[PDB]
mmCIF file of the C-alpha atoms, coordinates in Angstrom:
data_MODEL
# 
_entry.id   MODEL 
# 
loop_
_atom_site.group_PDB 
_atom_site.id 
_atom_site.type_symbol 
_atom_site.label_atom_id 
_atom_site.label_alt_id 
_atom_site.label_comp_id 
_atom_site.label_asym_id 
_atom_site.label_entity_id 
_atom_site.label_seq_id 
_atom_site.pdbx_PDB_ins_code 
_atom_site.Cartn_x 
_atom_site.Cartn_y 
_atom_site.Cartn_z 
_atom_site.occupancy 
_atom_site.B_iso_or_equiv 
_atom_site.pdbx_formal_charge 
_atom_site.auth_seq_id 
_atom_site.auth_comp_id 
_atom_site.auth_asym_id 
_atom_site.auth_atom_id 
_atom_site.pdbx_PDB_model_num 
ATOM 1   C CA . UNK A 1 1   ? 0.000   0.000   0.000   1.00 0.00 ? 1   UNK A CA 1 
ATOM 2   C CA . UNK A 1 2   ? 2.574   3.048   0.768   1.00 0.00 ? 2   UNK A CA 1 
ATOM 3   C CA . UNK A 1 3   ? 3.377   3.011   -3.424  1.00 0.00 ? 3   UNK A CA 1 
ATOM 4   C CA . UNK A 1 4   ? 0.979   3.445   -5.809  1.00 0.00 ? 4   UNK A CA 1 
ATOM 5   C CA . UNK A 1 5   ? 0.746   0.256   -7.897  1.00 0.00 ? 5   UNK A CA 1 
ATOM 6   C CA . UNK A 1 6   ? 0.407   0.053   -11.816 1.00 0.00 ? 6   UNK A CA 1 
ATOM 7   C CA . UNK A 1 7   ? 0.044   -2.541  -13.932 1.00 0.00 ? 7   UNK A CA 1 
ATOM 8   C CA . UNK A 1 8   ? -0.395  -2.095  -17.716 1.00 0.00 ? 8   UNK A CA 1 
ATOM 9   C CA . UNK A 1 9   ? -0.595  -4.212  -21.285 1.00 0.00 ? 9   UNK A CA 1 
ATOM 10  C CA . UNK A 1 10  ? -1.234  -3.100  -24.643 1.00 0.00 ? 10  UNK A CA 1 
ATOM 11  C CA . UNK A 1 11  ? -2.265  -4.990  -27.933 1.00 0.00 ? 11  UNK A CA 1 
ATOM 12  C CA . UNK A 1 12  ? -2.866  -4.741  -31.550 1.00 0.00 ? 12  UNK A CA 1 
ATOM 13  C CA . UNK A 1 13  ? -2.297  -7.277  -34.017 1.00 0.00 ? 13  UNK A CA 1 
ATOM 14  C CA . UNK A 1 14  ? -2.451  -4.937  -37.188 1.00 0.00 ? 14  UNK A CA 1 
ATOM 15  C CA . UNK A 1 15  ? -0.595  -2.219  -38.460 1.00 0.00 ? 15  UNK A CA 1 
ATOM 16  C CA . UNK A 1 16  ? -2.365  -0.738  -38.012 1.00 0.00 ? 16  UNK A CA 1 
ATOM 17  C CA . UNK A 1 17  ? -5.624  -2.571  -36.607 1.00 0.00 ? 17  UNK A CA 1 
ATOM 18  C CA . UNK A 1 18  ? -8.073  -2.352  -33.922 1.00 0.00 ? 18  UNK A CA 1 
ATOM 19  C CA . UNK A 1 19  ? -5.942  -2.443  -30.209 1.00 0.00 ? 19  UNK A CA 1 
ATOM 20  C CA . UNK A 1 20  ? -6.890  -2.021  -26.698 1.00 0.00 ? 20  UNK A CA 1 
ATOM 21  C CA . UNK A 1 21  ? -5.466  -1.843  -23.337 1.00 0.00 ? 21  UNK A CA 1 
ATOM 22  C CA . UNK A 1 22  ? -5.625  -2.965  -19.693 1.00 0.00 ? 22  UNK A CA 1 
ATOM 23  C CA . UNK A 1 23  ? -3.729  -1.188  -16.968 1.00 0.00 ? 23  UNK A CA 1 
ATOM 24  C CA . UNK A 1 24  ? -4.660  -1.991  -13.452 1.00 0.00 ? 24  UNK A CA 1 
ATOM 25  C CA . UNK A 1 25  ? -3.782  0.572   -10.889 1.00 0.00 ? 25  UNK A CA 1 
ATOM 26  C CA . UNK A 1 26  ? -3.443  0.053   -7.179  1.00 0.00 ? 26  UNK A CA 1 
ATOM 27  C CA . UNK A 1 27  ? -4.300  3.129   -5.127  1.00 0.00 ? 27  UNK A CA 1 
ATOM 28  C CA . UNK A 1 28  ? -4.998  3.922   -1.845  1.00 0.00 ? 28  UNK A CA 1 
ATOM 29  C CA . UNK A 1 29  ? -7.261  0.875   -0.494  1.00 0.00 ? 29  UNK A CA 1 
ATOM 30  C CA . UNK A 1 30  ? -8.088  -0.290  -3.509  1.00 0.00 ? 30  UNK A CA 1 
ATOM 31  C CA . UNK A 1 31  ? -8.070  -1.975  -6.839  1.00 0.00 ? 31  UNK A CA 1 
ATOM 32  C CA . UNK A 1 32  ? -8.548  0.489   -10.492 1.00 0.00 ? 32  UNK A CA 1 
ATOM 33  C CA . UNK A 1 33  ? -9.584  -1.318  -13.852 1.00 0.00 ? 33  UNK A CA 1 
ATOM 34  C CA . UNK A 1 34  ? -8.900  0.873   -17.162 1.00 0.00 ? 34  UNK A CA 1 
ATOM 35  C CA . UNK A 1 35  ? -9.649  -0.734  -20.746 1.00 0.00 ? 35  UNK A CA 1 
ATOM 36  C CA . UNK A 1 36  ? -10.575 0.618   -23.823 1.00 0.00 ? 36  UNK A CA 1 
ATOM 37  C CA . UNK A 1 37  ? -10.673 -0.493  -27.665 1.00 0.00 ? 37  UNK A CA 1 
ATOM 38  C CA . UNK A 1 38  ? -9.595  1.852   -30.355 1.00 0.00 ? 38  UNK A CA 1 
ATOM 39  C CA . UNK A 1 39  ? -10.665 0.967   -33.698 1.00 0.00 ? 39  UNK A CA 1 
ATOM 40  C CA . UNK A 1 40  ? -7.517  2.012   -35.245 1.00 0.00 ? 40  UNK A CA 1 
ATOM 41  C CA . UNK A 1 41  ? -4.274  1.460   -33.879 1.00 0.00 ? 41  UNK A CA 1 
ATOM 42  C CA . UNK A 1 42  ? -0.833  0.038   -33.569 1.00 0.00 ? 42  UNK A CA 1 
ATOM 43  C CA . UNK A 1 43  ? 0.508   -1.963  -30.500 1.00 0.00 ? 43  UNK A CA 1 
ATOM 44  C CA . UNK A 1 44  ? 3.202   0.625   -29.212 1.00 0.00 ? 44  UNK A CA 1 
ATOM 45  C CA . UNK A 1 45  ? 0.514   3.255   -28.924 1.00 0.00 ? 45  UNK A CA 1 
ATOM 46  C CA . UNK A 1 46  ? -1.819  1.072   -26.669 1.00 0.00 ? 46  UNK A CA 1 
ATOM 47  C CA . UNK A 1 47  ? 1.520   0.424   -24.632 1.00 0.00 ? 47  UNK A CA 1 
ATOM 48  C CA . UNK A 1 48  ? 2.106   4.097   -24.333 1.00 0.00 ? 48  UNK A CA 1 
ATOM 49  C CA . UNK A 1 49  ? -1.884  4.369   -23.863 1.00 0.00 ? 49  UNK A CA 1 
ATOM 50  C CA . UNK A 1 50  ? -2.032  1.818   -20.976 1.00 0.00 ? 50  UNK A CA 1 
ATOM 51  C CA . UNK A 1 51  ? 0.482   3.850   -18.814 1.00 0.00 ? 51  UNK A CA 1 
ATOM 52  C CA . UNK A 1 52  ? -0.947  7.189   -19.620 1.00 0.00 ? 52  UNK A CA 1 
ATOM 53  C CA . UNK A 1 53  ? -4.524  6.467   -18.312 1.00 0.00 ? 53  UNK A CA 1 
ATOM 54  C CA . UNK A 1 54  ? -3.676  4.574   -15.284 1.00 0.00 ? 54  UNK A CA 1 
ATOM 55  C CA . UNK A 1 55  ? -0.881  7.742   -14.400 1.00 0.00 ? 55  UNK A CA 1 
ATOM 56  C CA . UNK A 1 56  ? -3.206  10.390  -15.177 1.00 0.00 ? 56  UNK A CA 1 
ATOM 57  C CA . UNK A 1 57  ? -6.446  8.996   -13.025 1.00 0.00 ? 57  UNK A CA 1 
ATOM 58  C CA . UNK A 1 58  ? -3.273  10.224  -9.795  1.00 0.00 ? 58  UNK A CA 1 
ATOM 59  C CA . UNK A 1 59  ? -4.640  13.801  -8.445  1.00 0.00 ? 59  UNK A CA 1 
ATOM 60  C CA . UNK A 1 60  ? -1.791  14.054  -6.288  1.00 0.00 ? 60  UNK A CA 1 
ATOM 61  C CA . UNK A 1 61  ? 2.352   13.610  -6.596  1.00 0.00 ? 61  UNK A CA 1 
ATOM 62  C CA . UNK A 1 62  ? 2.396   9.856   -5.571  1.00 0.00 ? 62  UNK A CA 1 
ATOM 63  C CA . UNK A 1 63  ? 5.503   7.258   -5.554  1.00 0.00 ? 63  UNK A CA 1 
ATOM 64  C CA . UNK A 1 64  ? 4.662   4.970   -8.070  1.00 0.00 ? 64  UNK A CA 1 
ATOM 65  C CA . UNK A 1 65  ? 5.823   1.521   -8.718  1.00 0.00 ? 65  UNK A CA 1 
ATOM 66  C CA . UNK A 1 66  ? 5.836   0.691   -12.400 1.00 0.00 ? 66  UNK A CA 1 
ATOM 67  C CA . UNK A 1 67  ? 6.485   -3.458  -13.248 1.00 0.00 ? 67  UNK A CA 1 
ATOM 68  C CA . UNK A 1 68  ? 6.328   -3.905  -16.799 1.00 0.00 ? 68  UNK A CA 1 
ATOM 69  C CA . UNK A 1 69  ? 7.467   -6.490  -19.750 1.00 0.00 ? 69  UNK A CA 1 
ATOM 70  C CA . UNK A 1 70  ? 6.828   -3.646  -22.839 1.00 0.00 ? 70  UNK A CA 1 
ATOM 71  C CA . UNK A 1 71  ? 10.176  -3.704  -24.627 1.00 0.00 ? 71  UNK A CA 1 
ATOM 72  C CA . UNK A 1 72  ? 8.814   -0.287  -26.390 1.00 0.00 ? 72  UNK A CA 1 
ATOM 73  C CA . UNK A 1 73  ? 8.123   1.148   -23.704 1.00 0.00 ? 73  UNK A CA 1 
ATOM 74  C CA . UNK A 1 74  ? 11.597  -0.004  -21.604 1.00 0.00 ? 74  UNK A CA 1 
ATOM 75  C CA . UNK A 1 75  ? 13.668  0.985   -24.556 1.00 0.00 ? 75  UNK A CA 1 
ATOM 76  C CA . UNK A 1 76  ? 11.948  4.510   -24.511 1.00 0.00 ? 76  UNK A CA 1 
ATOM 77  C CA . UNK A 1 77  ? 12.413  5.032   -21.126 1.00 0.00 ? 77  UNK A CA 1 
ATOM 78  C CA . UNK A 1 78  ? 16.003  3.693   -20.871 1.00 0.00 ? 78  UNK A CA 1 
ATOM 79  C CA . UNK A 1 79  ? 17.301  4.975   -24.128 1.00 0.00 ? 79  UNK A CA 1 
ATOM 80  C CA . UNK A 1 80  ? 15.777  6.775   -25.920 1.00 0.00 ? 80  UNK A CA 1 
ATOM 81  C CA . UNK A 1 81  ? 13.795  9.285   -24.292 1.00 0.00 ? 81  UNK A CA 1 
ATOM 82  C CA . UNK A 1 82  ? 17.230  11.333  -23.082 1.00 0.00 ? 82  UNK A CA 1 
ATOM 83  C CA . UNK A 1 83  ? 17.980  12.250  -26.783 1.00 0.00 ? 83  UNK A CA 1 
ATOM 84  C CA . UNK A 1 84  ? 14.944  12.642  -27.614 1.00 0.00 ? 84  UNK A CA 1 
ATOM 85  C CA . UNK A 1 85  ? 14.131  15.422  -25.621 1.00 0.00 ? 85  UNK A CA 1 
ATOM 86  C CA . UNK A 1 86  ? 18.156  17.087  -26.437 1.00 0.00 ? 86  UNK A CA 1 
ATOM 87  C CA . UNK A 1 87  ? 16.653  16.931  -30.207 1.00 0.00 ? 87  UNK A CA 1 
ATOM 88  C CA . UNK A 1 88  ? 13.515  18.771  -29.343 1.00 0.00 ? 88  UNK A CA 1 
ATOM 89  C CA . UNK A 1 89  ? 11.847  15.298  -30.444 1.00 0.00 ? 89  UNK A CA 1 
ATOM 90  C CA . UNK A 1 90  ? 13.301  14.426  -33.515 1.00 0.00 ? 90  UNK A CA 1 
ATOM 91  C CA . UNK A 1 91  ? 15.550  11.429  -35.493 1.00 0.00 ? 91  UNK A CA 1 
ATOM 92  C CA . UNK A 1 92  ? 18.774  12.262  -36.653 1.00 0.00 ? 92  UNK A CA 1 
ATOM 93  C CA . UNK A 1 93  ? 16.704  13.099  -40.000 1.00 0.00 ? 93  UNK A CA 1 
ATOM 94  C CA . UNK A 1 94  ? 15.095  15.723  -37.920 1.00 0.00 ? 94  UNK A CA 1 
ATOM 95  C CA . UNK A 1 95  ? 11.328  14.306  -38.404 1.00 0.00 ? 95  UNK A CA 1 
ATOM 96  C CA . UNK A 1 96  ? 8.972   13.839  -36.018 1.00 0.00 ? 96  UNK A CA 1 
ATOM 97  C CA . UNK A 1 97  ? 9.965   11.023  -33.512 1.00 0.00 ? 97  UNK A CA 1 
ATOM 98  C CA . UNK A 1 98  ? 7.250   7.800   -34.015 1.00 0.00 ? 98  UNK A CA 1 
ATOM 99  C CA . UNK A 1 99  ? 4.425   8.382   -31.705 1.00 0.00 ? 99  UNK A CA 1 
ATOM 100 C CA . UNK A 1 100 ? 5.684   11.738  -30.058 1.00 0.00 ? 100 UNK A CA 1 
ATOM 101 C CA . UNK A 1 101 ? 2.167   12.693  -29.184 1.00 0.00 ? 101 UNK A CA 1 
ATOM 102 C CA . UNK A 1 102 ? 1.692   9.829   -26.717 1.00 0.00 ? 102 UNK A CA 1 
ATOM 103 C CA . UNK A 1 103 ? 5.528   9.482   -25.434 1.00 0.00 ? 103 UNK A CA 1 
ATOM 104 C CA . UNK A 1 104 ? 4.969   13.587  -24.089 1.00 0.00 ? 104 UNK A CA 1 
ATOM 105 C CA . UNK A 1 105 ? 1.505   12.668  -22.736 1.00 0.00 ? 105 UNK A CA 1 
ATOM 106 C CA . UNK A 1 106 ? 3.354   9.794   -21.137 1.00 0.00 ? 106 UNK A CA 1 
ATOM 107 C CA . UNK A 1 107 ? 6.268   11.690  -19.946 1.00 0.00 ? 107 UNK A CA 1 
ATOM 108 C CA . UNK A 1 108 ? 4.301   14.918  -18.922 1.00 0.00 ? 108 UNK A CA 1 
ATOM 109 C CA . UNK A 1 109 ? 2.605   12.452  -16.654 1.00 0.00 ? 109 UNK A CA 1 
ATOM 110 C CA . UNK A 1 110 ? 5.779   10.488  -15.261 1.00 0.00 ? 110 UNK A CA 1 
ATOM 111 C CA . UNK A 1 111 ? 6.819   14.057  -14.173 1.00 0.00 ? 111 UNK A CA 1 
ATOM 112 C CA . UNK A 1 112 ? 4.023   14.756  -11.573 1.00 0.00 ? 112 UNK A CA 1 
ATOM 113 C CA . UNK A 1 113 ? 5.214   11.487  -9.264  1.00 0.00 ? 113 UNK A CA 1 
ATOM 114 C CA . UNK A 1 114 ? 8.481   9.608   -8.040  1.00 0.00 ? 114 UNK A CA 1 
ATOM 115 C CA . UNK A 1 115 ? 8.556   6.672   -10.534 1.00 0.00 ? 115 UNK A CA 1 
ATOM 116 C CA . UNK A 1 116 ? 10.143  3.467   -10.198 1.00 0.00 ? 116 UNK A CA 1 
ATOM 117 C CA . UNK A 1 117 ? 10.576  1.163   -12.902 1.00 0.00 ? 117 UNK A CA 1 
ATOM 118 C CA . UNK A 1 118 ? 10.845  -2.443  -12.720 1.00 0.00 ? 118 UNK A CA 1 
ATOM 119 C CA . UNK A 1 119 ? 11.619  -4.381  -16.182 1.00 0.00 ? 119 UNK A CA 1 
ATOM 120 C CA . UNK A 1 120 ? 10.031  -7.735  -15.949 1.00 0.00 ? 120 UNK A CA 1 
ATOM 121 C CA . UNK A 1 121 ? 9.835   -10.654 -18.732 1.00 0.00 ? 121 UNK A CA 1 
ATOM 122 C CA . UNK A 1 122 ? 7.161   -13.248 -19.141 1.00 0.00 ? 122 UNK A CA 1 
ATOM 123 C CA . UNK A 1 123 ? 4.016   -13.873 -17.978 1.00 0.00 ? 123 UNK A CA 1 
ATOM 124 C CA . UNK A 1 124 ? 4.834   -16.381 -15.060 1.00 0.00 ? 124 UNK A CA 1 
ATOM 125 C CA . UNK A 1 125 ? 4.245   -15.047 -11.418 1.00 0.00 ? 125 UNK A CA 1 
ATOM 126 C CA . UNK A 1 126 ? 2.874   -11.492 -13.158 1.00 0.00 ? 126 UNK A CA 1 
ATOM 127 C CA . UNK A 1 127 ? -0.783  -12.253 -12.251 1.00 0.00 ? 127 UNK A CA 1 
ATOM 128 C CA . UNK A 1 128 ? -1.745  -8.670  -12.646 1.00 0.00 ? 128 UNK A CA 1 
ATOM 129 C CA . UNK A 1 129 ? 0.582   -8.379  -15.944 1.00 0.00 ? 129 UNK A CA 1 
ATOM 130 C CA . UNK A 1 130 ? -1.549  -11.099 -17.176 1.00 0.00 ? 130 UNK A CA 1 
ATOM 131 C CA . UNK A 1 131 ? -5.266  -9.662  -16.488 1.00 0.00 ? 131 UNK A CA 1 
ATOM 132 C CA . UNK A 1 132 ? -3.507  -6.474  -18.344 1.00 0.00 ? 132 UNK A CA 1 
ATOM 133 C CA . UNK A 1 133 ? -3.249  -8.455  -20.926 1.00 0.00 ? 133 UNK A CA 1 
ATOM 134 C CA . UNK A 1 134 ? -6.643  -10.380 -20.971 1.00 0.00 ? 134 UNK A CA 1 
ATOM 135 C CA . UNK A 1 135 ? -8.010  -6.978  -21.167 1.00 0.00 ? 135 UNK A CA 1 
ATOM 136 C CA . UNK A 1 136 ? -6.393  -5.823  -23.235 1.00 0.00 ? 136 UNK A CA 1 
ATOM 137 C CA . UNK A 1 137 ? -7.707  -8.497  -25.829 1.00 0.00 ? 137 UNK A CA 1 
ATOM 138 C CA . UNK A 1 138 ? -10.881 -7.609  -24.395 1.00 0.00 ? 138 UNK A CA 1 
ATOM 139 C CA . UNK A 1 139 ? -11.368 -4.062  -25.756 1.00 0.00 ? 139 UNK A CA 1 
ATOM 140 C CA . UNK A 1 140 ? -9.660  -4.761  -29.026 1.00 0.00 ? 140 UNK A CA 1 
ATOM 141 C CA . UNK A 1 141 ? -12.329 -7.512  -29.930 1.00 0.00 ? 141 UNK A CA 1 
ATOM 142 C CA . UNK A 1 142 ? -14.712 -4.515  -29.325 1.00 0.00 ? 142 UNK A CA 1 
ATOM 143 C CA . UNK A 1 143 ? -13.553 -1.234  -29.911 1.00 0.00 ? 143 UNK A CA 1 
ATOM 144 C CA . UNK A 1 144 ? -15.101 2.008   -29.274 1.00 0.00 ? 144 UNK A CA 1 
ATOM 145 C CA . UNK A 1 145 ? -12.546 4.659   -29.476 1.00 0.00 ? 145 UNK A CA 1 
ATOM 146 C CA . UNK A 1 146 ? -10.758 6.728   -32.425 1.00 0.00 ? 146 UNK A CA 1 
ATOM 147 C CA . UNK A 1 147 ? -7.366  6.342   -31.680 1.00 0.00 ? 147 UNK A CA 1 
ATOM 148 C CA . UNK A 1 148 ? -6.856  10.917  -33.083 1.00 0.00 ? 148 UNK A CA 1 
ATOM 149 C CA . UNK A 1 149 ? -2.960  11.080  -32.885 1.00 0.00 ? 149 UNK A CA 1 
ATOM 150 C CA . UNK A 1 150 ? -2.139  7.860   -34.981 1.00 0.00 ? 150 UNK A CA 1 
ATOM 151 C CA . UNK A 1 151 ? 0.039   8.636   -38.376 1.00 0.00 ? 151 UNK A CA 1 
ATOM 152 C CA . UNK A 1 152 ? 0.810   6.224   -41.098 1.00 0.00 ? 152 UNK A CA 1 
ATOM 153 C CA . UNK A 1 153 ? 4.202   4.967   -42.072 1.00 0.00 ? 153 UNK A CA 1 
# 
């Protein structure tokens, strides 16, 4: 209970193609479900997605404890974020960074709280990890949402 809990997962099997999410978040005395469908997506942007709901539901600075398997999102945070942000959010070929809309949602909301990351790898002994991901699933069999900041290519 003293840290804030989330637990997130993120899927899409198209490129793009109807995705969803589940993040769970643990807060206070209790137990958060978040899961939506969007009807046109890509994977890395319900990863990004996942994280950015359950963060943003926090009113208050929290410490938060975040355990997740997304290579996207690990590599992001652990490599590739730093530049980024030197760059003013471009590539070397000074476009647009992939997904920049949702990676400064994401990070806009990692800066309101005390944040640690824990990089975890399958499924085994991840029960919430796993209900992420059954949601996840979920919402992309039925999706509701227009996913507005998606670009081709």
């Amino acid at each position: 209970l003293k840290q804030v809990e989330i637990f997130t997962d993120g899927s899409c099997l198209g490129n793009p193609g109807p995705g969803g999410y589940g993040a769970i978040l643990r807060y206070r005395g209790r137990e958060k479900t978040f899961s939506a469908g969007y009807t046109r997506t890509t994977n890395n942007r319900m990863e990004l997605m996942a994280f950015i709901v359950a963060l943003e539901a926090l009113k208050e600075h929290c410490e938060v404890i975040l355990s997740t398997d997304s290579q996207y999102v690990r590599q992001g945070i652990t490599q590739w974020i730093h530049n980024w942000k030197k760059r003013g959010w471009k590539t070397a070929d000074k476009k647009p960074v992939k997904n920049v809309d949702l990676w400064q949602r994401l990070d806009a909301a990692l800066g309101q709280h005390q944040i640690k990351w824990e990089w975890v790898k399958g499924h085994a002994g991840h029960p919430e990890n796993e209900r992420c991901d059954e949601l996840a699933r979920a919402a992309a069999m039925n999706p509701t949402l227009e996913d507005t900041g998606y670009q081709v290519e």
